[PDB]
Amino acid sequence: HCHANEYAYAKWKLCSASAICFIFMIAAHLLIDLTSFLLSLFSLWLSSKPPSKRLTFGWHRAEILGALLSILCIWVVTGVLVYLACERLLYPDYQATVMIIVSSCAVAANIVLTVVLHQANASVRAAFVHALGDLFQSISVLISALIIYFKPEYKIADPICTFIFSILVLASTITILKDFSILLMEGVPKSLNYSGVKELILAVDGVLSVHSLHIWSLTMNQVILSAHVATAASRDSQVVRREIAKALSKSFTMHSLTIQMESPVDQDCLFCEDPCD
Amino acid sequence: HCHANEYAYAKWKLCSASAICFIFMIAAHLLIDLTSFLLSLFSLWLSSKPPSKRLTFGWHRAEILGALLSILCIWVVTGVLVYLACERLLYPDYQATVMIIVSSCAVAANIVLTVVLHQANASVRAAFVHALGDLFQSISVLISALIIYFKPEYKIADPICTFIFSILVLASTITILKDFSILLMEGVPKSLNYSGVKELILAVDGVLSVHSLHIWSLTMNQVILSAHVATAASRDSQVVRREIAKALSKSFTMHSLTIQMESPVDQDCLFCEDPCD
Ligand SMILES: [Zn+2]
Ligand SMILES: [Zn+2]
Ligand SMILES: [Zn+2]
Ligand SMILES: [Zn+2]
Ligand SMILES: [Zn+2]
Ligand SMILES: [Zn+2]
């Protein structure tokens, strides 16, 4: 045959944040937040579906697609806030404490959303940064309000306040796009290393030359491995991988293995060579 | 060992469209169109790179990531044009033939961009729809101009003109997102069929029960196959797949095969069962 509660864990942790912004009707930004969540949550309902004929590996990956969307909804939001800050700069006419407690309530609220996403699921590490950004964005108008209120002589420190805080957003979203670009490109995941498994595999008896390895991954923790191995022709074949699986599954967890057990007649070729790093 | 000119074909066909909008400095929207292009082209330069250690399958898939971006740059563009049409509706003050030949030159120009992308590469079928949309968008202001100029009594037919033509954009971009959602989710590609290969494989002698098939695809024409097959224990194993490859490669083209040749002792399980369709 050659053969848990992390799923609803987020559904717990995520549905909360959806309600907070929902209950946050004390007015744009909030409405936009109320949109990213449910959809992203709805994606979390997708990965639960069983693998269908059209999607053989199943809807596992769909989470990231929802996640990667949430990120690009942050760039649009902050994209507006830089252009308006520019408009708020070029049209300098604007007029306080009224604009403080309306933000004094917001900043503390976003801490709630952020702290409950205390770092698993990608959507978690996707909605989290969406909130964190929305926090640092929120303190901009606050930390400015407690500045111009006391020092209204300038009243122009607010634009740069956003400008420096906008970068605090984008410089905090790259760390997630350095990763989700590797997933959608079928690259080796973070927690592993390409040569880190070749040697780890070459440490078994029958193997001769692991050629044409391919190890991509699904969302965050689902990894899939695939390779062709060369075995001692005098040695029995099936028994070897009968351990290699154990040899790998013991090393760490998998979601599907396919090993080919090619025979010791390979035309010693760029395709089954090596990655040139 | 168990072992063309389509690449630069687009680089030919794509660099052209990049120059046309570049040379189109006869004014914004043109600049946005220019930004979308080169990047997408730059992605086409990525897929040429050889497979590296971090990206085992290689940068083939990266094209789609660039492609899928171009699409979402269309929704943003048309997103602006519906809100402005709304603003152009709610603020009805606006005032002709001056606004005709400035568009009479545009519409015909977009035909050039579209016709040279006469339907291969995804980026082709990605930049194409980006242009086609930008055409139907362009005729809106034109077909309206030759209406209100002759019948200025209304001058309100222009908003709905965009509104109906905006849908002509989005209803033309879905056909590409029905597909590129299957690629990034590792689903079986269009040109194939899940059961279409099981039977096509089960038509060989040694095979007993192809279990745990997995057939996803890279960008458009690169397909990868992977499966475990059961063979007659009395029959020799390696010789079977020594044909199955031919049996499939003869059927159509591949980019990597991994077959496991499991033995006839499988615990007759949901995992190696079937996709429930
Ligand atoms: Zn799965
Ligand atoms: Zn091989
Ligand atoms: Zn080779
Ligand atoms: Zn390739
Ligand atoms: Zn098997
Ligand atoms: Zn099974």
Author numbering:
A (entry chain B), B (entry chain A): 52 to 54, 64 to 87, 105 to 172, 175 to 198, 210 to 358, 361 to 369
Sentences reproduced from the published study:
ZnT8, one of the 10 ZnTs that have been identified so far, is localized in the insulin secretory granules of pancreatic β cells and responsible for the accumulation of high level of zinc inside granules, which is required for the packing of insulin in the hexameric form. ZnT8 functions as a Zn2+/H+ exchanger. The structure of HsZnT8 in the outward-facing state shows a ‘V’-shaped dimeric architecture similar to the crystal structure of EcYiiP, with the two TMDs forming the branches, whereas the two tightly packed CTDs located at the base of the ‘V’ and mediating the majority of the dimerization interactions. Our structural and functional analyses reveal a total of 4 Zn2+ binding sites in each subunit, including one primary site in the TMD (STM), one site at the interface between TMD and CTD (SIF), and two adjacent sites located in an open pocket of CTD covered by a HCH motif from the N-terminal segment of neighboring subunit (SCD1 and SCD2).
Volta phase plate was employed in data collection to enhance the contrast for better image alignment, and the initial data was collected using the wild-type HsZnT8 (HsZnT8-WT) sample prepared in the presence of Zn2+ (1 mM). The single particle reconstruction yielded a map of the transporter in an outward-facing conformation, but the overall resolution of 4.1 Å is insufficient for accurate model building. From the structure of HsZnT8-WT determined in the presence of Zn2+, we also observed cryo-EM density from a third Zn2+ ion coordinated by His137 and His345 at the interface between CTD and TMD, which is designated as SIF. Interestingly, SIF is positioned right at the cytosolic entrance to the Zn2+ transport pathway and mutation of the two SIF histidines resulted in marked reduction in Zn2+ transport rate. As the physiological function of ZnT8 is to transport Zn2+ ions from low concentration cytosol (free Zn2+ concentration:~1 nM) to high concentration granule (free Zn2+ concentration:~120 nM), we suspect SIF can help trap Zn2+ ions and effectively increase the local Zn2+ concentration, which in turn facilitate the ion transport against over 100-fold concentration gradient. The density of a bound Zn2+ can be defined in the EM map of HsZnT8-WT. Although the side-chains of those ligand residues are not well defined in the map due to the resolution limit, their locations and conservation likely point to a classical tetrahedral coordination as observed in EcYiiP structure.
